[PDB]
Amino acid sequence: YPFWAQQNYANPREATGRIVCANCHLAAKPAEIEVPQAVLPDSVFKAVVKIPYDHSVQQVQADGSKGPLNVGAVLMLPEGFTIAPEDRIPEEMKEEVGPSYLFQPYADDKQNIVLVGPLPGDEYEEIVFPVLSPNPATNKSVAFGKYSIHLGANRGRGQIYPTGEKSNNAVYNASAAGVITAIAKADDGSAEVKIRTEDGTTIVDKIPAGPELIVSEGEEVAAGAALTNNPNVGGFGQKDTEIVLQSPN
């Protein structure tokens, strides 16, 4: 969740440009963002974000059962830019943009970094951010010019928790090489795979409900080999765009 990015990373964009959601949402999927080519100072414009996925495909949920996906994103605007206050949103636009409550600043001193979600993916095919450009004439920290906007967008449950533990929406691997002597399947959906190592020892790898086993009893497996499919059907992607903070006329 966006909140887990806030708790663990003061800066959501690493030196390489990689956005921190990627540290836990391991699969890559597209991220789209559309903004006007240029905007006048102290003006409101729309930033349209899309996070594609096949709405007919369900994902493994926290309880292991199949369900819908939720989406979320971090939109990094240039210095001075912020989500537009409601009273600054023009009339014809108010019904074209997301409601104010959808948007959360990354931090008090990073209001140009906007977070949205989790939101139900089936209801938000486009997330439209109403953005207020700054005014260089009265704000010395910002100047007219061309700037970059960075988008990080996710759909679906991540693979690793803030605790460092893997979620049930990930591949589980053989903790050691050997032969599978048994597969204890709880009607809980979870499982325990007993592996007989090449010299007597037997180890047990626990797998939560959700992932599908792709090994069978009596089967040999290498260390690190996959015991399950990769049930993940979502992903996180990034996209950059530019915008010109323009001088009137």
Binding site for ligand HEC (CB under 6 A): 1-2, 4-5, 8, 12, 20-21, 23-25, 62, 69-74, 117-118, 152, 154, 156-158, 160-162, 167
Residue 247 token pair:
């001088």
Residue 19 token pair:
């956005």
Closest to Zn ion by CB, 78 or 211 = 78
Who's near 159: CB < 8 A, 6+ residues apart? 24, 25, 26, 166, 167, 169, 170, 232
3-state secondary structure of 90: coil
Cα–chain center distance at 135: 31
Question: Residue 148: which of Zn ion, ligand HEC, none does it interact with, CB under 5 to 8 A by kind?
Answer: Zn ion
Q: Kindly state the DSSP code that residue 224 receives in the 8-state scheme.
A: T
Closest to ligand HEC by CB, 115 or 131 = 115
Question: Residue 174: which of ligand HEC, Zn ion, none does it interact with, CB under 5 to 8 A by kind?
Answer: none
Closest to Zn ion by CB, 148 or 181 = 148
Question: Residue 193: which of Zn ion, ligand HEC, none does it interact with, CB under 5 to 8 A by kind?
Answer: none
From 141, 169, 144, select the one nearest 66 (Cα to Cα): 169
Q: Binding site: residue ranges?
A: 1, 21, 24-25
Question: Residue 210: which of Zn ion, ligand HEC, none does it interact with, CB under 5 to 8 A by kind?
Answer: none
* Interface positions with Zn ion (CB under 5 A): 125, 148
The four Cα atoms 124, 127, 130, 133 give a dihedral, to 10 degrees, of 170
Q: State the Cα–Cα distance between residues 172 and 208, nearest whole angstrom.
A: 9
Closest to Zn ion by CB, 125 or 192 = 125
Q: Binding site for heme: residue ranges?
A: 1, 21, 24-25
